[PDB]
């Protein structure tokens, strides 16, 4: 259809909505669009960046001399975070420059000015140079979450790692200093890493991260056991206390059809339910619920197979099942042989498909959720570029009331869902190097 749209010069990774402007994180570019019609206002060129042995990140290398180039590299945006607390500012983190972050500050009376004030977040670490706190993001795959606690900003990161010694962390928390120059790991318990032994053998994909019920939750796809080839979905959950990661416990998230096991999480979304769904699942109108789109695996692989499910987990039931003691210590942190021990739960938490096998012949690669009266609706994307909206209800699946090819490229899991006054608003949906505005109610 004729829906508001913008095609980019380069593929789009991340997106954030702030002060009536859409900010696209794309290869070598941050684009700034108009909320109304997706009209391009301003663009920032982030790459391609020259990697040189004599250059250090966030120092003005122009000034050195006639620099004979090392490698030119494409600056893929790995993360895009809005801070409102220290400044009115946008923090972007690139694949290039050691996974360093840069922050764009907004002039008071001009929202769209990403080029005016741009500070680079890096401070030379001399005592222990191998330990870089300002090196945030992995070019393989990275998930950034930005909490505000006790008038100080924390960054919970989840980096995918294969062996490249030089020095990032699998799961970590770092505090952005009040001077805003750099980050700092407070304790040695502020991070958890995969052992040098299993960096390549045991890879971890960080699907989604979110704060809820005074906890931090990370969703992840990894091997079921260090030895085993069969792949797995897990819900990591740790406490935020003492400026460290405490009470860290991975446990398996399962989605079954009735056993067909949809064992790989493709995308996820945390939201409130509609009165109809709330009643059905034993939940309340204010309760956070993790909506998660799963997929069946090719055997001995993490690759999906064009067979999707979708199942809901109210975090309050996730936490209850978590507080139930059976157990092993975390296989990948130690060797194989809220309050000090890093844990791996044996038994999977499982849930019945909420569509009851309605999508067994398609690959779902995206999910949003919004509420219309008593009904909960879900904005599904697909690998074929097929969008669709469908009512959610455990008691009887339903034909998608909207459904059409938005593009040929897969629908990205990176999504926005805004509300205008009157409860009706829109969804922003990415397909390759194209973003489109779709309304919620038809």
């Amino acid at each position, epitope marked *: 259809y004729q829906l508001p749209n913008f095609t980019a010069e380069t593929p789009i990774q991340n997106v954030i909505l702030h002060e009536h402007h859409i900010f696209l994180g794309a290869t070598n570019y941050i684009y700034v669009l108009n909320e109304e019609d997706l009209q391009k206002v301003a663009e920032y060129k982030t790459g391609p960046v020259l990697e040189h042995p004599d250059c*250090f990140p966030c120092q003005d290398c122009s000034s050195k001399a006639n620099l*004979s180039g090392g490698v030119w590299k494409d600056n893929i945006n790995m993360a895009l975070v809005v801070d409102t607390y220290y400044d009115d500012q946008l923090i972007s983190c690139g694949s290039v420059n050691r996974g360093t972050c840069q922050r764009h500050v907004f002039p008071h009376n001009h929202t769209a000015d990403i080029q005016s004030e741009v*500070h680079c977040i890096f*401070s030379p*670490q*001399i005592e222990e140079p191998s330990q870089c706190p300002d090196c945030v993001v992995s070019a393989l795959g990275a998930k950034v979450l930005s909490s505000v606690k006790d008038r100080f900003i924390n960054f919970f990161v989840g980096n995918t790692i294969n062996s490249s010694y030089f020095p990032l962390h699998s799961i970590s928390v770092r505090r952005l200093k009040e*001077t805003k*120059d750099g980050f700092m790991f407070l304790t040695d318990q502020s991070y958890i890493d995969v052992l040098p032994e299993f960096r390549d053998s045991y890879p971890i994909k960080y699907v989604h991260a979110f704060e809820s019920n005074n906890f931090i939750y990370f969703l992840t796809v990894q091997r079921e056991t260090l030895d085993a080839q069969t792949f797995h979905t897990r819900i990591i959950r740790f406490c935020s206390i003492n400026s460290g990661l405490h009470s860290y416990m991975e446990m398996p998230l399962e989605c079954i059809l009735t056993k067909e096991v949809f064992n790989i999480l493709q995308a996820a979304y945390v939201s409130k339910p509609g009165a109809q769904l709330a009643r059905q699942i034993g939940a309340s109108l204010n309760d956070d619920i993790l909506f998660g789109v799963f997929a069946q695996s090719k055997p001995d692989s993490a690759e999906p197979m064009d067979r999707s499910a979708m199942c809901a987990f109210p975090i309050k039931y996730v936490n209850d099942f978590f507080n139930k003691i059976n157990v092993r210590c975390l296989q990948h942190f130690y060797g194989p042989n809220c309050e000090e021990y890093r844990t791996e739960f044996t038994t999977a938490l499982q849930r019945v498909d909420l569509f009851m096998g309605q999508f067994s012949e398609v690959l779902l690669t995206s999910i949003s959720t919004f509420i219309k009266g008593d009904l909960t609706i879900a904005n599904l994307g697909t690998s074929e570029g097929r969008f669709m909206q469908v009512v959610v209800s455990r008691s009887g699946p339903s034909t998608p009331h909207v459904n059409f090819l938005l593009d040929s490229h897969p629908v990205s899991p990176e999504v926005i869902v805004e509300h205008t006054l009157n409860q009706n608003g829109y969804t922003l949906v990415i397909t390759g190097k194209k973003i489109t505005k779709i309304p919620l109610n038809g």
Partner: antibody
Amino acid sequence: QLQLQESGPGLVKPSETLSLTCTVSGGSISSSVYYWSWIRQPPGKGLEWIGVIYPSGNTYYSPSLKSRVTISVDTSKNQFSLKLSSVTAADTAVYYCARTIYDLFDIWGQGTMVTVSS
Amino acid sequence: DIQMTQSPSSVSASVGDRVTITCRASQGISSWLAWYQQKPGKAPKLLIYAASSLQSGVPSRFSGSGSGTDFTLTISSLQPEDFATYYCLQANSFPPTFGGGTKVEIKR
């Protein structure tokens, strides 16, 4: 903790070229992490930077001096050296060799007095 | 090329005092700053790097802060050994540039 010690002529004529050498001990000159640079201090004045050599082997010099300065490394003698040329009364200063990590100086030699005089 | 203006150039303060030195830059250094202490006829000794990271061997009574253009170094409780000339160095952009210097004397 490695140590640095400068060496070379106390006295050098005007127009002649100056040669110094900083000899490293308790650590290799060849490292991926730390690298070498020269700094001087004119008598009763502030510090002023001369040049660096990175582990790449690339050399950068202060624009004040670029025409005359040459810094080099000798992996076999665990040494690096400075050759300043067309030397003038203005170059009379204490020459400090310096270990360098992320373009900041962490370890320093005692320094050598070099006096330019006929 | 990047002017580093230090102040004051001289200072005198009693043992126990909190003496405080300021470095000001002509450009955005961000964090690429170190603070050096030079005893007379000696090599400069690194105290602070990255504007506010205290060096390994250094007394806690030293500390600095700042970002962008304006940085300061504070000796919280002055000592007779803390007699020296103090320097700020910039390394955000070449050539690296040192400040004028601050001489610190003890009152007695």
